[model samples]
Target chain A: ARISLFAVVVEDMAKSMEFYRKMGVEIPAEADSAPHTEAVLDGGIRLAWDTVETVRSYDPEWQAPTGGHRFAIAFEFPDTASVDKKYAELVDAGYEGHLKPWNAVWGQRYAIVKDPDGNVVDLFAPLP
Target chain B: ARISLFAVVVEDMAKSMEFYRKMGVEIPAEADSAPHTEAVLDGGIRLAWDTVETVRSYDPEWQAPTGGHRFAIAFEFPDTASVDKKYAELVDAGYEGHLKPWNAVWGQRYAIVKDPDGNVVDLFAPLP
Candidate 1:
């Protein structure tokens, strides 16, 4: 078996789609109003988003997760500078910037932000 | 930018590593005791696990997420039978089987199980 999909439960489909699209997910405008949307990434893996109501229709016991950080989805840019650029753009667009871009001890430029549902999203790229 | 990593913060590195190794992640044994570990998947995306303390060292405000079904990481099997087989094996090994294997309306055999951190993990394959 292989990792095939990363699914996010979103509170609002349109809002979430916009945030991801700016963060580099190629979601079509048509999917903005759908209850469920999927986009294939550079690799074969799929990124999927399901609206809260859509999940409730199938999973009656589903509840919104509470707290700061559960898991993080990290995106990679072509270079260290792009990581900072994207993080600034997202933050300027009203998304919460959880961490300012910094050269991590592990040798990558990294930063963190929050998606529409407050899910942690990371941005990173190799530092020369 | 593209998704390069999916990270889960766990309470115990060894326990979480064992659970994921059974779920088809090829994590090395050496990572079992590490504070942070990473495994590259078939698609070049990295799957990472950071112990709770590892996260707190960087973010003092980190808190454990509560409630059910915040997000899901899905693994695809080679066939429908493999989905059920793997699901059964995991459940038998003391994992919480959130959803028994079923033929999903989207033409796939699907099942849901909880990882060591009570995170939702899905198994699926084409029905045909």
Candidate 2:
């Protein structure tokens, strides 16, 4: 069994797609729920959105704040443009954007967006 | 390689230990940092703390709000009392307690505590 390294719930589907797509993450498949989406990294990072209440059913004690930066994933990439491109896509998709691709003190160019569940998804390009 | 299924960063170790020990999680190792620790679930879930900035060093572009409920994890268990016991432990450990084992609208008994990093760690019991 694989141990958890991270988790997130997003509130918006279209916006999330636009944001994550440009960061080099491929959408392996689209989920059936209109408000939900599922994607996987090549390495098998499975992310499902729009089932917040449903997944929360299995783990009843999980408390999800109804609004404001609920949860997210930090993705590292090879180029700053990757983050900018992804952020642009989210804007194009009408997401409430929160970042612009810029160099970080920690050494990456980063940007971010929200998913269908209102979870933040951060994208970063490694330091050169 | 492992994919994330969950994640948390705590703010106080003593209080966190008090809250979790009663919940069935044990401390496996104390970290080198004065106020930090590391623990592993029996199944090999490794959790390390006290290096938020250090970790962010590897991914500078990742952002963390200096205060507020930055992040937390949800743990499920078989009994509600487990959460009470854990919450008591946090109180004993001098943690700023946030919950008592109580039935959730979702159906599990859950509680919470803070770590040295000021992150929330949620404890939850599975729905029977």
Q: Compute the lDDT of residue B55 as modeled in candidate 2.
A: 36
Q: Each model's C-alpha lDDT?
A: 0.87, 0.52
Against the true structure, what is each candidate's TM-score?
Answer: 0.94, 0.50
The segments of candidate 2 whose C-alpha lies over 4 angstroms from its true place after superposition are A1-72, A114-119, B1-72, B76-81, B105-107, B114-120
What is candidate 1's lDDT per residue for A49-86, written digit by digit as tens? 99888877756688997896668999999999999898
DockQ of each candidate relative to the true complex: 0.77, 0.11
lDDT, candidate 2, A24-108, per-residue tens = 4555455434444556544443444444455344444445554333234666555777678767876786775766677776567
How many clashes would you count in candidate 1? 0
